[PDB]
Each structure stands twice: as C-alpha cells, then as structure tokens.
Amino acid sequence: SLQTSFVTLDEAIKITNRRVNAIEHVIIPRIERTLAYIITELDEREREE
Amino acid sequence: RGKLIAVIGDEDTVTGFLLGGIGELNKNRHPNFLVVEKDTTINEIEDTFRQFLNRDDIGIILINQYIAEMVRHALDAHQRSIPAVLEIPSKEHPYDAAKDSILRRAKGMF
Amino acid sequence: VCLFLNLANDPTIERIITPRLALTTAEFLAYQCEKHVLVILTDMSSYAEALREVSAAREEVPGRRGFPGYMYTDLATIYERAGRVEGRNGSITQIPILTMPNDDITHPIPDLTGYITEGQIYVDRQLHNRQIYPPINVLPSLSRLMKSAIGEGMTRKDHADVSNQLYACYAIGKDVQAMKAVVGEEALTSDDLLYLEFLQKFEKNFITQGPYENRTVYETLDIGWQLLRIFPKEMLKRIPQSTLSEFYPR
Amino acid sequence: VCLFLNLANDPTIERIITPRLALTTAEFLAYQCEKHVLVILTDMSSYAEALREVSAAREEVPGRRGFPGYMYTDLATIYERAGRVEGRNGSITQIPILTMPNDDITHPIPDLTGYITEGQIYVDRQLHNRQIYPPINVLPSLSRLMKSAIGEGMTRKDHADVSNQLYACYAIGKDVQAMKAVVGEEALTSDDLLYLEFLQKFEKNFITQGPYENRTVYETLDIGWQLLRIFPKEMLKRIPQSTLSEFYPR
Amino acid sequence: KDRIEIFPSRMAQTIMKARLKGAQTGRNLLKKKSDALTLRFRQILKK
Amino acid sequence: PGGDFSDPVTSATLGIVQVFWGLDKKLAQRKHFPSVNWLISYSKYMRALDEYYDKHFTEFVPLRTKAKEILQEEEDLAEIVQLLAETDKITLEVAKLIKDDFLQQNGYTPYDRFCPFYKTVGMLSNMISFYDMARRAVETTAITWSIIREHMGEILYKLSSMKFKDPVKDGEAKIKADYAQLLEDMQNAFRSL
Amino acid sequence: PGGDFSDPVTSATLGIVQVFWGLDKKLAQRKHFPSVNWLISYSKYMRALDEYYDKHFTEFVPLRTKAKEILQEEEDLAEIVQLVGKASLAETDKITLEVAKLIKDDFLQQNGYTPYDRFCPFYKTVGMLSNMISFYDMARRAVETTAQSDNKITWSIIREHMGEILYKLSSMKFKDPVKDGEAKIKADYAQLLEDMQNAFRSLE
C-alpha cells in the first residue's frame, strides 16, 4: 500500500510542479511587457496633446 | 474479499506463502503462482508474468531478487500503479538495497 | 592618435560641434594624405540629449519619445561621411559606440542608428552577469558585408555555410533550452540533449577568447568545425552536399 | 440607380460636400417622388480625414486626435436624414460603411459614429483568416430597433428568445474555448464538449452562407431550431417551457 | 509570443493588472500545494 | 465611452451623487443591459429602510448580506477557475444561478414590467436557503457537489424557469403558492439526501 | 517607427494598397531569408489569377488550400504543444507538425544568394509542393488505417523507414536550374515520387 501510494504521489507531484513551472515562466513576461507597452503609448499620447 | 496475492518464486517461499493462506484456482482452473527451478525457461516465465499482469484479480505480486534480475527489462518497462510489484530476499541471494525499480522511480533520494 | 576630449562638467552644447570637427579631420587625413583612419566615437546618447535640449529650446515639432524630427538627418550627416572613393587608396571606418538606456531595443536612438547603418554588435548584460568575456551576443548581431567581404579567393569556399549552420544551430539550441526550462529533461529526446551540449560547447569555447590572445581566421574556422563535428552529417540542413562530404570527415 | 463617383486622384475637398448632394437627392426622391430609397455611403473615415484637414488649415481648437470638436454635430447633420414621415409612404434607410484603423473600436470615428448610429455589425479579421464568408462577428453586434420589429404576425410567434438563447450559448462557448486554451481538454467536462461542437456547427452552418444564397426568414428560424436541437431541454435557460413543448418536439 | 494583441487604453491597463494579480494568487496557491505534497512524499519515502 | 469609469464626468458623478449603478464592460458587450459591476457601486442609504423593514419583511436585511458574500466569493473563485474542488463549485454555481435569476435579460418583453417587491423577495430567499443547506460540504450532516447536481435534475430547470411569471394574471396568492411548492420541493429533494 | 505597426503611415499604406506582405523581426533573427510572416500577409488577386493558373497549369488550388490548412493548424498547435509538452498528442498532430516543419525549413526557407537557388521557376515550385502534399497525404491515410485496424504506425517507426527519403526530400532543392534542364528536373521528381510510392507499398 505504501509504495503504491508513493508512486501515485510521485505522478501527481511531478505533473503539478510542471504546471506551476509552466504558468510562472510563460504567462507573466507577456503580461508585464504589455503593461510597459501600454504605459509608454499613453505617455506618448499625453505628451503629444 | 476477492483479490489475492500472487507469488512467483522458489519452492520454500511458495510453500510458506501457500501455508500463509494465499492460493486459488479460478473457474478456468489456472493457478495464481508458478514454481521456478533450474529447468524453467525464460520465455515461459516472462509469458506467465505478462499473463498475470493482464489478469485483474491479483493486485500484488512478489518476486525474489534473482528472478527479478533475469526479467528486469520487463519490470523497468512496467510503468503502472495498480499492479503493484515488490521484492523479497532468498536463501542464497541476500537482499541488497541497490537493485529495485521503485528506487529508480525516486533515484538519488537515498 | 588624433584625440579630442569633453567632460560632463563642460557646457553641453559644444557636444553638437565636436564630432563634426573630428569627422572633418578624418576627411582631411583620408582624401588629402592617402591614409587609412580608424575613426571611433563614444556615447552618442549624450549627443542625442544635447540635440534634444537645443530642439526643445527651439520648440520644433517633436517625434517619438519627444525627440527632434531632424535627429535622423543629423545622424545621417554624422555617419554617411565614410567609405572610400575612386582614385584614392584611403578609407574611412567608423565605430560609433552608443549608450542604450534601459536595455530597450525599441528605444528610438538604437532604432534610428540601426536604420542609418548596416551592422550591429549588441554587447550583452546577461553574458557579463554570467562572468564571460568577451560578452558579445552572437544572435542579435548582424553584418551586411558578407555579400562580398567573404567567399572563395579571399578566405575560403566554406565560410558562409559554416556561419549559417552555426547561427541556425545556436538559435534552435536557445529554443530547446527555453523548452527545457519547463518541460524537463525526462520528456526530451536525444536531439535536444545534443543541441544543449552544442550550446554549452559554443559558449565555453567559441565565445571565450580572452583579453590579449589574437587569433587568426583559420583557427576560428577550425574551432567552428570542431564544434560542429558533434552533430552527425544528416541533421546539418544548412550545408551543401559537396562541402559536407569534403570537410566533415576528420 | 444614381451613381456619384470619387477616385483617389481627384481633389480632396470635393469629399466635404459629396455626401450631402446624395442625401438631398434622396430626400427629393423619397418625400416628393414617393418612392422607397436606400442610401449607401462609403468610407466615412475619409470624410473625417478631409474635415480634419480643413480644421488643420483653419487653426481652430483641436479635440482628441486632432479632430475638430464640432465633427460630432457634423456627423449628426449627415446621419439624421432617415426614417419615413407622416402623410407620405416613402422611406429612407442609411447604410454607411466605415473603416477602423488598426482594427480598433475605441478609435474616435467609430466611437462617435456609435454615438450617432443605433447599431453595429463588426466584420472581424479573425473569422476572415479561416475563410468564413461573410465573416460577421455576432458577438459585438447590436440592433436596438429589433425590439418591436418582430413577433407573432410580423415574422413568427417564437423568435426573440431563440436569438437570445443562441447568443448566450455562443458567448459561453467562447468562454469554454478560452478555458481550453488556458488549460487543455483534460479539465473539460462533457458539457464543455457539447458547447464546443455547438460552436463548430454554429460557425459552419449559420454563419457561412455563400455568394448568392438568398435565404428566407422561416428557413433561418428552422436552422436556428436545428442548431438548438443538439442540446436537450435542461441545458437551455433563456427559453419559455411552453414554446419548447410547442416546437422542440418535432 | 512577445505580447498579447490589444489596443492601448486605460481599460486594458486595468484588465491586465487584474489578470496579473490573479496569476500571482494562483502561483502562491500552487506553490503551497506542491510544498505540502513534497513534505508528504519525503515522509512516505522514509517510512 | 466603452465603460470608462475614469472618464472625468464619471468622477464628477461619484463626487456629487451617491447612488451609482455598476455595469461591467465585459458583460455589457454581451447585450446584458441589466448587468452590474457591483464592485463599482455604492448605496447612498442604509438607515432609510430601517423603519420600513421593521414593518414589512424584516428578514430581508441578512439575506442580501449573504448574497453579497456570494457575489465577492465568486469574484475570487473566478480567478481560481482561470488556472479545482467541489467546495468552491458550490458557491460558483449558486452565484451563476442567482446571476441568471436577477440580471434579467428580458429585452423589455411585457412580462418583466412588473414590480411586486414582496413577490420578488421570494426567489432571493429560496436561493439563499438552497445555498445555506448546500454549504455544509453538500452532505447536510457533514458527498460532493456532483452528487446533488445529478440528483436534482429538473429542479434546477424549474428554479431557472421561476422568472417567467406574469403577475398581472397569475394572482398574488397563486404566486405565494408557487413559492410554497418551490420550497417544499427544496425540502423534499434535500430530505431524500 | 521602431517596428510598431500602429503608426499612421503604416495604417494608411495598408488601407490604400491591395497586396500586403509582412516582415517579422524574429524571422529575420532566425536567418530565415525571406522573413514572410504568412499570418498577417494577404493578397486580393488570387481570384483574378485563378483563370490563368487553371488555363496554363491546371492544378494549383488543392495544393494551396491544403498548404494554408497545414500552416494554420501548426500555428494553432504551436503554443498548445508548448503548454502541454507534446505528451497527449495523437499521431495526426505529430505528422501535421513535422510535415509543417518540413515545409518551413525546405519550401519556405530559400537562400536567394547561393548560386543554385538564386532563382526558381513556377513549375519547379509546384512540383515541390506536389511531392510534399503527396507524401503528407499518403502518410496520413497509412497511419489512419493502421491505427484503426491494428499495428498503429507511430511517427518513430515510419521515420526510421523513411529517414533516407525525407533526407532526399530536404536536399531536393539543390538543383541549380541553370545547370539542370527542366525535363531532367521533372524526371527526377517523378523518380522521387515513385520511390516514395514504392516505400509506402513496402510498408503495406
């Protein structure tokens, strides 16, 4: 019982660790880069006005 | 209630385990064990191992060290959970902790 | 060594004049004395800032980030004064290194300097933080004079295809490195490990050059061939058949 | 058919008065000749550009994005010559087309036209990328005057709730599509699969019509019922049970 | 890729900020979950 | 313009007036005319209806508080869903159902043009009670949300169809009877568990 | 101005022009000459040229439609395979993405400065695309039937079988039409086609 639960736990832990790795190292950079772009465009428009 | 331990090994271990209470013949009269000796062929033992893997009434399988070594390739190919596999010592093969697939699954965490 | 100086504490607006004077000197030494001149500048960002301040004082029509509209034409008058002409053995070479604020490639000064010129180098901050020298990122760099500077009769008949193959291998190595950053080594394939090992070799050996170890073209070509030798011939999709059969089996 | 023509090579200031001529002729052909007229206007962003050019020549106070403040009143004056009148029997329908620079919705001219015109269609580039003709995005569309233009006797007893149910189902299906993109099919339930196949069939049949496929109203209602049939009774929420018992079982 | 398609405006600034915050909330939750799971994994391995 | 909360006009309204009505852009592009971004929304008064409630339906006061708790709980669990369990699905589904019930996208069809306040607190109370009995880890004595989902069946369908009453011809007493049979169906379906 | 495509001039030139082509910084960074984006680029003259292409070549439409479908499917599945680690992918996905990679690194990649491919004629191009589409279609039907009945043809085993053939399909661009007459080129193309057919019959 112990070792069967151990291997199932290993499967679960590797998949969830992979998921958190993916979301953290993928989703965020695009988000803050778009934040930089949007603030830059807003400031440019204001200076032109 | 219905699930049973299957054991493949030498004569002493199977004797002691059949004494322990495991052992059934299904409706088709097929044993849940196979006795190994000097004149037991490799193809037959791996074939019967495959047959036991297919069967859905075992759950637990026990193998002594040397038989596992001789069929290590299939055990390493095995990547399931419900058909659990364990290891046991033997009379002339004292157990060593450096040979088992479950440790390969968690290699380095010794 | 024709040298000129200007410090931060000095008045800002004479920086608009200094490079033009240096370029006039270069013109005089090139097309009147039959000499080659290695003109080099530094810190064009201060020049851009001084021109910006002058334009703001003169309230012209702004542009991107508030820069002057004619900053481009001014930069053209600074840079296009170069090359060599008929009847003269002299030549003009420029290396106008510039500051790059915030490490942003889309910042106007790097952009316009890229338009007006042919090539770039783009020394890297990440490599310098990795403690490697000379830290030049090889990928973003580009030179447009391969079209005639290299080839048979000058260096060799296999320089261009070696460089193209190396660029492709490095780019795909970076991509598989990004993939490995999440996926993990277990799910990879043999090709991925080969590419990672090639990238490791490329960084430890090719780029690492040292401060005072002059190296010849032939040695760099041999080093590149040794680096490329790790991949078998089949997956080399940027080399012609003839050159691959001729040079690879060593 | 009366045709007023403008090319690119012609002068630009003609466009300031070109629409008004057509509108006045439409007024005469409707309120005096008693006929039913249908005006078509093309590229109102060009009208906005010409007006902005006049404003730039006229040195008045500029509004947002340089367009004059009174362009709102001008668009009002050019978009109000519509509707039928008492004592007559003619009608005037305005069907302009306008381009959104950079596929933008908050661009000034789309917004002001939205504040004058009652409704929208929003042809989408994404649908056009997958070759669906006409690529009409139902999601941001709107037609306020549908409120009393349909019902028993006019088109059919059971009409509006069908459109509402189809619409809500489409929106939730797009949500499921986004959730599939974020995570994957593994987290999707059977209901999500039903929504996805609804999306596929909805796009395939109801949207795609063809070059000259003049469909009828009753046929489109039948097609809507057909697209509703795939779900059982329980899933639908914005539909009366009486209507379902009346029509769904057939 | 290098960005997500959106027309610049204050609206997208607010929406991207909200999505960002939700992303870190998820990151915290998943990190804590994985930490507890690793602790349990080590315990069962020793036992 | 396009749901501009930061429009200077809007800041002036928030400065001077105190009853602000929300309308999320993300749902307003979906023709949800009676939808709300209740986050950006303030109630001018709460003490005005103390004397009114003491005389008429005093039990409204905590029910709306619980509903607001649901409304913020979904506002967090939505981003949890963006990236699960059944315990959160309880509140998510309750929030979706109450949103379908109250944000009445009727298109001004005549059956929505009626306001019996006392015959419109009933479905609020029913949903609140349903959530209260489902909040105890589903199993009243503590079973997941899926168990009750496939157990209820047509019950949720009729809970949704609750909105399609025409008060002018139904009669107020018949509407109270409809509330009563709704409630007894709730208790029967949960007593079976 | 800085690669940003929202500049007023870019929008005006887009609104006036009939044919628009896209250049992407990363594609030029790949040394993928030319850096055609094939995603925002479009034309509006295929319909007019359909008459000519039918009158003079009589087969271009199926090739074009299938190529567009493959490119769109690969674009859809790129970030998907990035975000699922190519784990739970059907054989169809793998064949689609790898033939798309073949189309990218052979048919789209074209160094216009190497002497053998400074210029390419239309007939050779359609021959290339015909060979590639035939390979993809035959592989698709083979793997489909084998998966349906038994002994599923995974990508690994077919790749082992046809490594040599896909290597030739990659290296086939090395023709030098100035040194190679058109008749010999089409003969070699038919020869490669029947080689592929013979291999596919050898499998089944």
Phi, psi of C240 (to 5 degrees): -65, 160
Q: How far apart are CA E45 and CA C208, in angstroms?
A: 44
At G7, list the tokens.
């500049």
At D104, list the tokens.
């933008």
Give SS3 for C64.
helix
- Judging contacts by C-beta atoms under 8 Å, the chain B residues touching residue A6 are 102, 106
Beta-strand pair B33-35/B5-9: parallel
Q: How far apart are CA C39 and CA G165, in angstroms?
A: 54
Segments making up each domain of chain B, as ranges: 1-110
For residue D124, the tally of other CB atoms under 10 A from its CB is 16
Q: How far apart are CA D227 and CA D224, in angstroms?
A: 5
- Contact criterion met (CB < 8 Å) for A26 and G85: no
Measuring CA to CA, which residue among F193, C193, E22, F79 is closest to residue A28?
A: E22
Residue A1's closest chain B neighbor by CA? B84
F110 touches chain D (CB under 8 A): no
Q: Are C14 and C6 within 8 A, CB to CB?
A: yes
Alpha carbon distance, N-terminus to C-terminus of chain F: 51
Q: Are B76 and B104 within 8 A, CB to CB?
A: yes
Long-range contacts: D167-176, Cβ < 8 Å, 24+?
Answer: D167/D138, D167/F30, D167/F31, D168/D237, D168/D238, D168/F30, D169/D195, D169/D198, D169/D231, D170/D138, D170/D139, D170/D198, D170/D199, D170/D202, D171/D139, D171/F30, D173/D198, D173/D199, D173/D202, D174/D139, D174/D199
Q: What is the largest distance, in Å, between two alpha-carbon atoms of chain E?
A: 58
Q: In a 10 Å sphere around its CB, with 0-12 CB exposed, 13-18 middle and 19+ buried, how is residue C47 labelled? A: buried
Q: Are F94 and F131 within 8 A, CB to CB?
A: yes
- Contact criterion met (CB < 8 Å) for E11 and F82: no
Q: How far apart are CA F190 and CA G16, in angstroms?
A: 67
At D161, list the tokens.
């709730």
- Contact criterion met (CB < 8 Å) for C187 and G1: no
At C167, list the tokens.
């660029």
The identity of residue B17, as a single letter, is: F
Q: How far apart are CA D95 and CA D121, in angstroms?
A: 11
Indicate contact of C with A: 3+ CB pairs under 8 A.
yes
Q: How far apart are CA F16 and CA F10, in angstroms?
A: 10
In sequence order, which residues have a C-beta less than 8 Å from that of residue D110 and are 6 or more positions away?
D98, D100, D104
For residue G5, the tally of other CB atoms under 10 A from its CB is 11
Which CATH code for domain B1-110?
Answer: 3.40.50.10580
Give the best residue of A2, A20, A28, A32 to mutate against chain E (max E CB count within 10 A): A20
The identity of residue D235, as a single letter, is: M
Torsion of CA C228, C234, C240, C246, to 10 degrees: 70
Q: In a 10 Å sphere around its CB, with 0-12 CB exposed, 13-18 middle and 19+ buried, how is residue C162 labelled? A: buried
- Contact criterion met (CB < 8 Å) for A18 and C183: yes
Sequential DSSP letters for D179-240: HHHHT-TTS--HHHHHHHHHHHHIIIIII---TT----HHHHHHHHHHHHHTS-TTT--SS-
CA distances to A7, D53, F69 from A4, in Å: 5, 77, 42
At D73, list the tokens.
């009143």
Long-range contacts: E36-43, Cβ < 8 Å, 24+?
Answer: E37/A9, E37/A12, E37/A13, E37/A16, E38/A13, E40/A9, E41/A6, E41/A9, E41/A10, E41/A13
E46 touches chain D (CB under 8 A): no
- Contact criterion met (CB < 8 Å) for D105 and F108: no
Give SS3 for B80.
coil
- Contact criterion met (CB < 8 Å) for G3 and C147: no
Q: How far apart are CA D223 and CA D148, in angstroms?
A: 23
Long-range contacts: G145-151, Cβ < 8 Å, 24+?
Answer: G146/G204, G147/G91
Sequential DSSP letters for F129-188: HHHHHHTTTSSTT---HHHHHHHHTHHHHHHHHGGG--HHHH-HHHHHHHHHHHHHHHHH
Q: Are B64 and B36 within 8 A, CB to CB?
A: no
Chain F residues in contact with chain E using a Cβ-Cβ cutoff of 8 Å = 2-4, 6, 25, 79-80, 82-83
Shortest distance between the Cα of A27 and any Cα of chain E, in A, equals 8
A7 touches chain B (CB under 8 A): yes
Which one of D139, D171, D234 has the shortest CB-CB distance to F157?
Answer: D234
- Contact criterion met (CB < 8 Å) for G72 and D130: yes
At A10, list the tokens.
């290993």
At F84, list the tokens.
């699960």
At F108, list the tokens.
């001004």
Give SS3 for C40.
strand
- Only one residue has tokens 């990649």, namely G109
- Contact criterion met (CB < 8 Å) for C62 and A47: yes
Q: Are D173 and D195 within 8 A, CB to CB?
A: yes
Phi, psi of D221 (to 5 degrees): -60, -45
Dihedral sign for Cα atoms in the order D50, D52, D55, D59: negative
DSSP 8-class letter at D120 = B
Partners of C39 in the β-ladder: C94
At G186, list the tokens.
């089409």
Q: Are A16 and E30 within 8 A, CB to CB?
A: yes
Q: Please count the helices (runs of H) and the strands (runs of E) in chain E.
A: 1, 0
Q: Is there a binding annotation on residue C144?
A: yes
Left (φ > 0), alpha (ψ -120 to 50) or beta: where does C54 sit? alpha
In sequence order, which residues have a C-beta less than 8 Å from that of residue A47 and are 6 or more positions away?
C62, C66
- Contact criterion met (CB < 8 Å) for A13 and E41: yes
- Judging contacts by C-beta atoms under 8 Å, the chain G residues touching residue A26 are 82-83
Q: What is the largest distance, in Å, between two alpha-carbon atoms of chain A?
A: 72
Shortest distance between the Cα of G15 and any Cα of chain D, in A, equals 8
- Only one residue has tokens 């080594």, namely C185
Q: Are B83 and B30 within 8 A, CB to CB?
A: no
Q: How far apart are CA F104 and CA F115, in angstroms?
A: 13
Q: How far apart are CA G201 and CA G142, in angstroms?
A: 10
Q: Are D137 and D124 within 8 A, CB to CB?
A: yes
Q: How far apart are CA C130 and CA G111, in angstroms?
A: 35
Give SS3 for B33.
strand
Measuring CA to CA, which residue among B70, B53, B62 is closest to residue B7?
A: B62
Neighbours of chain E (3+ CB pairs under 8 A): A, D, F
Measuring CA to CA, which residue among G167, G165, G159 is closest to residue G142?
A: G159
Phi, psi of G176 (to 5 degrees): 60, 75
Which strands form B60-64's sheet, in the order they lie side by side? Answer: B33-35, B5-9, B60-64, B84-88
Host H or E run for residue C92: strand C91-96
In sequence order, which residues have a C-beta less than 8 Å from that of residue C124 and are 6 or more positions away?
C135, C136, C137
- Judging contacts by C-beta atoms under 8 Å, the chain G residues touching residue D129 are 72
- Contact criterion met (CB < 8 Å) for A3 and B84: yes
CA distances to C161, D71, D100 from A48, in Å: 48, 21, 22
DSSP 8-class letter at D169 = H
F157 touches chain D (CB under 8 A): yes
- Only one residue has tokens 């296009």, namely C80
Long-range contacts: F178-184, Cβ < 8 Å, 24+?
Answer: F179/F119, F179/F122, F179/F123, F179/F126, F182/F122, F182/F126, F182/F158, F183/F126, F183/F129
Phi, psi of D208 (to 5 degrees): -70, 125
- Contact criterion met (CB < 8 Å) for E11 and F3: yes
- Which F residues 14-73 touch D at CB under 8 Å? 29-31
Give SS3 for C190.
helix
Shortest distance between the Cα of D103 and any Cα of chain E, in A, equals 8
Q: Which residue intervals of chain C are DSSP H helices?
A: 18-31, 44-57, 71-79, 108-116, 125-129, 146-149, 159-183, 190-201, 217-228, 241-247
Q: How far apart are CA C174 and CA C181, in angstroms?
A: 10
Residue A26's closest chain C neighbor by CA? C182
- Contact criterion met (CB < 8 Å) for G83 and D184: yes
- Judging contacts by C-beta atoms under 8 Å, the chain G residues touching residue D101 are 8, 11, 15
Which one of D101, D130, D186 has the shortest CB-CB distance to G11?
Answer: D101
Neighbours of chain G (3+ CB pairs under 8 A): A, C, D
- Judging contacts by C-beta atoms under 8 Å, the chain A residues touching residue B106 are 6, 10
The identity of residue D81, as a single letter, is: R
- Which G residues 120-149 touch C at CB under 8 Å? none
Host H or E run for residue A10: helix A2-48
Partners of B85 in the β-ladder: B61
In sequence order, which residues have a C-beta less than 8 Å from that of residue D55 and are 6 or more positions away?
D62, D66, D67, D68
At C140, list the tokens.
């973003």
Q: How far apart are CA C90 and CA C30, in angstroms?
A: 6
Q: Are C161 and C245 within 8 A, CB to CB?
A: no
For residue G96, the tally of other CB atoms under 10 A from its CB is 20
Q: Are D39 and D26 within 8 A, CB to CB?
A: yes
Give SS3 for C24.
helix
- Only one residue has tokens 């216009």, namely G112
Residue A40's closest chain E neighbor by CA? E8
Measuring CA to CA, which residue among D200, D248, D210 is closest to residue D226?
A: D248
Measuring CA to CA, which residue among B108, A17, A8 is closest to residue E36?
A: A17
In sequence order, which residues have a C-beta less than 8 Å from that of residue B36 and are 6 or more positions away?
B8, B9, B10, B45, B67
CA distances to C83, C134, D70, G49 from G53, in Å: 48, 55, 52, 6
- Contact criterion met (CB < 8 Å) for F2 and D167: no
Q: How far apart are CA G134 and CA G169, in angstroms?
A: 12
At D124, list the tokens.
């989408």
CA distances to A40, C8, C110 from C96, in Å: 28, 19, 12
Q: Are A47 and C62 within 8 A, CB to CB?
A: yes
Radius of gyration of chain D (CA): 23
Q: Which residue intervals of chain D are DSSP H helices?
A: 18-31, 44-58, 71-79, 108-116, 125-129, 160-182, 190-201, 217-229, 241-247
Q: How far apart are CA D236 and CA D168, in angstroms?
A: 10
Host H or E run for residue C41: strand C36-41
Beta-strand pair B84-88/B33-35: unpaired
CA distances to D207, F62, G4, G24, G38 from G41, in Å: 24, 59, 16, 11, 5
CA distances to A10, C160, D112, D170, D178 from D175, in Å: 33, 50, 30, 9, 5
A36 touches chain G (CB under 8 A): no
DSSP 8-class letter at D87 = T
- Judging contacts by C-beta atoms under 8 Å, the chain G residues touching residue D186 are 88
Long-range contacts: C220-227, Cβ < 8 Å, 24+?
Answer: C221/C155, C221/C156, C221/C158, C221/C159, C221/C162, C224/C162, C224/C163, C224/C166, C225/C162, C225/C250, C227/C166, C227/C198, C227/C201, C227/C202
For residue G59, the tally of other CB atoms under 10 A from its CB is 10
Shortest distance between the Cα of D9 and any Cα of chain F, in A, equals 36
C-alpha of G2 from chain center: 31
Sequential DSSP letters for G130-199: HHHHHHHHHHHHHHHHHHHHSS---HHHHHHHHHHHHHHHHHTT---TTTS-HHHHHHHHHHHHHHHHHH
Residue F102 half-sphere exposure toward CB, CA atoms < 13 A: 20
Shortest distance between the Cα of E46 and any Cα of chain D, in A, equals 33
CA angle C82, C103, C126 (to 5 degrees): 105
Q: How far apart are CA D46 and CA D50, in angstroms?
A: 6
Q: Are G165 and G199 within 8 A, CB to CB?
A: yes
In sequence order, which residues have a C-beta less than 8 Å from that of residue D129 and are 6 or more positions away?
G72
Q: How far apart are CA D129 and CA D135, in angstroms?
A: 9
A22 touches chain G (CB under 8 A): yes
Measuring CA to CA, which residue among D162, D161, D169, D153 is closest to residue F109?
A: D161
D vs E, Cβ pairs < 8 A, gives: 7
Shortest distance between the Cα of D7 and any Cα of chain F, in A, equals 34
Shortest distance between the Cα of D8 and any Cα of chain G, in A, equals 9
Measuring CA to CA, which residue among C52, C56, C45 is closest to residue C109?
A: C45
- Judging contacts by C-beta atoms under 8 Å, the chain A residues touching residue G80 are none
Alpha carbon distance, N-terminus to C-terminus of chain D: 46
Give SS3 for C88.
coil
DSSP 8-class letter at D158 = S
- Judging contacts by C-beta atoms under 8 Å, the chain F residues touching residue E30 are 83
Q: Are D196 and D176 within 8 A, CB to CB?
A: yes
